[PDB]
Design a protein around this nucleic acid. Sequence first.
DNA 1: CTGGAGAATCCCGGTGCCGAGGCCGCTCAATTGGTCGTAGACAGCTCTAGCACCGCTTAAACGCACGTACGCGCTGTCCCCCGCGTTTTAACCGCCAAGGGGATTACTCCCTAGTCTCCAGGCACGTGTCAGATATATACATCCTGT
DNA 2: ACAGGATGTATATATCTGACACGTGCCTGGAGACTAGGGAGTAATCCCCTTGGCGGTTAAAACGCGGGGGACAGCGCGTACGTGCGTTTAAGCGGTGCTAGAGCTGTCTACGACCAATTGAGCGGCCTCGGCACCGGGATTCTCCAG
Lengths: 107, 106, 83, 81, 91, 91, 97, 95, 14
Amino acid sequence: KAKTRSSRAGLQFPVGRVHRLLRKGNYSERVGAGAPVYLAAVLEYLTAEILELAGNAARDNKKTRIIPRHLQLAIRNDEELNKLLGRVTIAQGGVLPNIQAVLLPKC
Amino acid sequence: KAKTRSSRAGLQFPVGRVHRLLRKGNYSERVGAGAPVYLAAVLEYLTAEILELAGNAARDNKKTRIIPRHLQLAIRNDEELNKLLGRVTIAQGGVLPNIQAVLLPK
Amino acid sequence: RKVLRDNIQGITKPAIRRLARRGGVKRISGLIYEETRGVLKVFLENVIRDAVTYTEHAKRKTVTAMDVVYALKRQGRTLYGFG
Amino acid sequence: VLRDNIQGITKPAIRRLARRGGVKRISGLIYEETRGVLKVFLENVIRDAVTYTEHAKRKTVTAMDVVYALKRQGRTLYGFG
Amino acid sequence: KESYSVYVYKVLKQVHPDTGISSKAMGIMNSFVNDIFERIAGEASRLAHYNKRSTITSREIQTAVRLLLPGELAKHAVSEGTKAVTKYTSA
Amino acid sequence: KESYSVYVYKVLKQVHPDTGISSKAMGIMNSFVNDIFERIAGEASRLAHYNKRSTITSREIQTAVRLLLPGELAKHAVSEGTKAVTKYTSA
Amino acid sequence: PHRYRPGTVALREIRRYQKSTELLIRKLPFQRLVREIAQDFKTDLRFQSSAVMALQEASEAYLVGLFEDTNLSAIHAKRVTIMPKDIQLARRIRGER
Amino acid sequence: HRYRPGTVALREIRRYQKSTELLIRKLPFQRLVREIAQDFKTDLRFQSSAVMALQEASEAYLVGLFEDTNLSAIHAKRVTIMPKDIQLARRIRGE
Amino acid sequence: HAWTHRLRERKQLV
DNA sequence: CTGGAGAATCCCGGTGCCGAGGCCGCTCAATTGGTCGTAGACAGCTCTAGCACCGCTTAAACGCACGTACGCGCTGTCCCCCGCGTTTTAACCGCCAAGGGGATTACTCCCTAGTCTCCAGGCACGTGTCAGATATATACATCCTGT
DNA sequence: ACAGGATGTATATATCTGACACGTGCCTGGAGACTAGGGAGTAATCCCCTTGGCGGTTAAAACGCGGGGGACAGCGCGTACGTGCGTTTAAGCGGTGCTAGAGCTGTCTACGACCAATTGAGCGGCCTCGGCACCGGGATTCTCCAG
């Protein structure tokens, strides 16, 4: 009898929470019915790629618990997520291990 | 007796048109009474100092109509307006006359 | 006529030289010209792919000047003088 | 109350940042010049972050007041919201 | 709302009582006023959500002016707007 | 609303069913979801005023996704969201 | 006959084009470029005439913004000419690459 | 023995690009912040996480200069960065 | 596999 | 350049412990179910303005040749910065205490949305006319190759 | 350098012209007046957490020194780019013509706000325990100069 509307969409993000944030967020006078359904799937998809990539990062550093260095390495090793988050500072993030080619010992 | 709110506040920008644009803009649920009065002073102040400076530039080129070259020269020769309008381009504005000193002879 | 091939060469060499001399450029090497064609190629693609999607959202076959302004206000390059 | 305090940003501390930035060799005049950059950069963030606190009629600068000042200047910071 | 060109022209005659303005220069000033309008109101709206309020007051705009306008533009426009409010309430 | 950490953790167990996440890394993902939320909704609100409408629909968000997400993130998330809507209306 | 030195005519033109504000790309090749790019997004589009004029006067303002910065990156490293290193550097500092 | 100059500096770049910890001592950083805010409003207080936010933002800002300062010095066919390079890189950046 | 057709990774294995 | 060389990063196992992670109540927010009413879809129509084509100018692009000034490689100098060691400063930690101020709760009033009537400001649309553009001649301030 | 020849560049006058400034009618949006209700002011709590101080350990900063590597100035080659002339290609007017579609109006209806009653998903709290961390111990791995 409950049948939460996120479960009708086959998602995991709360559609009813998003619909509440759209209405009291002062975005428009009205919010359509399909709007928070469509938005919650997009927010699910974006987390589903970062956690998939950062999960591969921690597996490569032989750790089973994602810490925010792995979020830094997962984002900056793309070109789409890097373009999306080009002006984002991550706490405890660090820098990619990049050294310029001129700054290397010759021969 | 009309006595519009701009005349009541001693300004010249329309307080009523600001107050309608605040309410018809989804900025908040409510708009205070002193709020569109306070915007209409600020917008009237900022347009006063540009037309101050652009009027000086049109006098320096011996002209009377302000042309958008003069708006470009008025903004870019004021460092506070440059921080306000750094990301803003102006149609038919042009560039300041600026040649780097290395390029000059000899 | 239909396919409209290769008008990037329509931006000529002296057209680029005029643009360089607003910047205060005294000497221009010969390899700037192929680069500058490549630069505003990818500049206009980022503006048109925004401005078209405003028109497709408004279900119009035309592209207005106001849609261009909204694409440029988006990228932090606001125009004055078109609305 | 507080004296010249930019000298607390020490010479090896500035060196550590350039090593993370990827700088192999550093000239001597930089150490009194990046101190002039933080002095600009913090005065543009703390000026905004105080005006959030004075608007909310508080006396303590919260963590969100820093994040709101940083988000305004195009430096969005995660990990504190 | 269609323009501010009447109100811009009243300020121009007030400051420089002899100069004029072309139509293209008026359209830039018309686009200029609309730009700062949702710079201020679009940012003062964010101050209401950061304090969980629902009204935009003069206090909400005064701090939004101090964020946007740099330097002495802040110190004048804040002093300018408070003259307008105190004249408005007294009359 | 206080967090998304329940929902983030459900996705994480769905993708990598063995890995975990620290609290500091959860707080970044919590700040991440809130950032794109008013990136999309704050920009899809502007599409309603540009067309003089008052409702935000799925169509208003679909074009707002195509503005924000670059490259193949657009081509997947649009295809992702339309699967959710058609499943929602059919059920 | 009379002949100027190689660089005095160059400084003559910099004083010329920084003084005036006309659009410097010829219109009809630019107005033909935009329909090259628009075909790759939606076929059979139409353009307002003011919409194309907005696309010159932003893109010309964009390219002059480059050549002010590539000039500085060529004065730095002690040159006068501009190599395409300079364009590639003063776009990667801006964060466009 | 003694290493050649430069090889130690490369090994630091190998190390500090691998760690994520804060490279400025925290107590002189707080004393710096409280005297800058001394000018704006007297007698202010700070949350401890509020200063750590200013720590991590300003460190990521200064690191953000030094990869762009470094590209300026390589562009001048040099290795040592100089205050010419910082004044360039923040001026192209728009400051 | 949770969602391979949904997610994007084509090139390359890094 | 090879070679031990010392130094250093890597892999190794072992404590071990604090922070993920999974329980538990439980309550406030999401759901179901109706019900207005209006925003919005849709059809129809007007007519603007955008596309297409015409020729005919002529400005501007193009191509070419030439000389030269700048890029660039090279060399040499030196000095300034790195590396290392020793000594000194104070960050750091742990602990403690005090109270300011954030946070919450009631309470009440004054402020703002809302409605209706009302009307004058500010639109659209006109129309003269002067600022400005263009042209032409003059005077002048250039560059510059000679001497 | 001087000089003057030469080339632009500024200056003054004259003459169009079409966009600016002004006027007018009208109309619809701002003002006035009033009511209602709730958002926010205000006082009064609590109690968290920030500030302050202290002592000890020790890591890190500071200092000095020596040396060599890099910055930098100088020099020279030579070639790629400016200048300019002649040729050629389209841009640019301007004029015509067509119709697509943008804009607007008028219905109408489905969709979303609103509401009330009703759970259970999600928060907080409280547990445990194991992933990761630190420690120690070799183990390879570059780096280095003396050959």
